[PDB]
């Protein structure tokens, strides 16, 4: 009978659903999100691999988003650097173990739950490289989010509403120790006192800039495009700023 | 005055709008998708770049979702073949001069623009190796679906609605060639006299399924989880009923 064996398998998820503050309307997704390639106990759900191809692209958009729209209007360069460092396995699995995804994942592997359990050890120390990163752990942190996506009508919206809590902090930390864009320092410093000039056409085909620090004078910047001009002109200015006199 | 030059640099996406079939609210963000880095002459708006991020993950998602949601019910490995030959700069290149985004690509670079026109007429060619792809036309398929996002309030269905026509045709040609899930393959041919018996657990710690077809026998198959071994006893079933005696 099958939803006896769900009964059985889903035992203990209470737990984790009031942790992650989300209720499953059909537990069927739960235990899928769940479910190693190696748990033979499942005899009634997929593993969780489709699950954790869905979830992938989810929190790739959701904290694509996040880092686009972040008041620090960090430069492409250093938003594709974050993006690298965020939508990551390594950075999944850690999520998943600080939020004790460990305690409900279904595998038959002593040995992977021997890398799992030193890995939380680590983790847990870490937060008061010759620790291996079981990658399963970053699997379900995404198939999780594929799972509340498909229980929830495929809404994106409850999905970040469930996995903000778990990311942002994370987010905010890399996002804040990341260079700052030049443009963006300067003016939180010099809001109504940092001007730049119009982009002016250099013999060598760049664009130069100047920014005027009102009693600071006029920094020049060049660069192959008006965006990487402005920076320049800006990276100088700070660095005056900086020096104080 | 901005808005003067903003009509100046504007001038010709008219026909772009029709083509696509979207009509910008704020024409400042159509003109940043297609602004290249080299395009100096646009001295209002920031390049193309970070709509590039925001787009990059953007049609990751939908394409992944669309994957995901396919009825040919793809494994999870082809899945992810599948995903890897989509989201894809190359792909999203011949897209765009496909669509006619070179038309109105705003940049200052000969040579660019030599490499777009052996591309543009390549792909014509092949559509009625030693041709280079330019990566800025994969770059604006996806800077302009940040710009749609934007635009429409940061709509994913307005940015569907417009890419969908599109990408499908090309989606569902890659689809349609990669390897059929043998599960899928079988049950589209018999789908009431296919049946699948309960997983056992075989002594190396596998699982074995039979799928028995009604009118042709009864085929094994084993492997390292319950996916696997149905897979592996439809794709022997296929095989004798391709066969046909």
Same mark, same amino acid.
């Given at each position: ?14 737990? &984790? ?16 999100? &769940? %479910? ?15 699950? *954790? ?36 396995? %390594? ?21 992977? &739950? ?10 847990? *120390? ?58 963006? *320092?300067?003016?939180?410093? *010099?809001?109504? =006192? ?7 056409? =250099? ?43």
């Amino acid at each position: 009978d099958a939803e006896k064996t769900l009964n059985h398998l889903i035992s203990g998820f209470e737990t &984790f659903e009031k942790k992650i503050n989300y209720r499953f309307k059909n537990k069927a997704y739960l235990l899928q999100a &769940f %479910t190693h390639a190696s748990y033979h106990y499942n005899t009634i759900t997929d593993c969780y691999q489709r699950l *954790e191809f869905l979830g992938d692209a989810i929190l790739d958009y959701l904290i694509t988003k996040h880092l686009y729209e972040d008041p620090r209007q960090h430069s492409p360069g250093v938003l594709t650097d974050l993006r690298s460092a965020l939508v990551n396995n %390594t950075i999944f699995a850690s999520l998943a173990v600080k939020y004790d995804y460990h305690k409900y994942f279904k595998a038959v592997s002593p040995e992977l &739950f021997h890398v799992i359990d030193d890995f939380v050890k680590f983790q847990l *120390e870490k937060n008061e490289e010759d620790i291996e990163v079981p990658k399963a752990m970053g699997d379900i942190f995404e198939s999780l989010a594929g799972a509340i996506y498909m229980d929830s009508g495929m809404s994106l919206e409850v999905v970040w509403q469930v996995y903000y809590p778990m990311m942002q902090p994370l987010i905010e930390k890399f996002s804040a120790n990341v260079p700052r864009s030049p443009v963006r *320092e300067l003016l939180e410093m *010099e809001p109504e =006192t940092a001007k730049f000039s119009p982009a002016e056409r =250099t013999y060598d085909g760049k664009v130069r800039v100047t920014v005027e620090v009102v009693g600071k004078g006029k920094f020049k910047g060049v660069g192959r495009s008006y965006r990487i001009a402005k920076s320049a002109a800006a990276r100088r200015a700070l660095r005056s700023l900086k020096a104080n006199q």
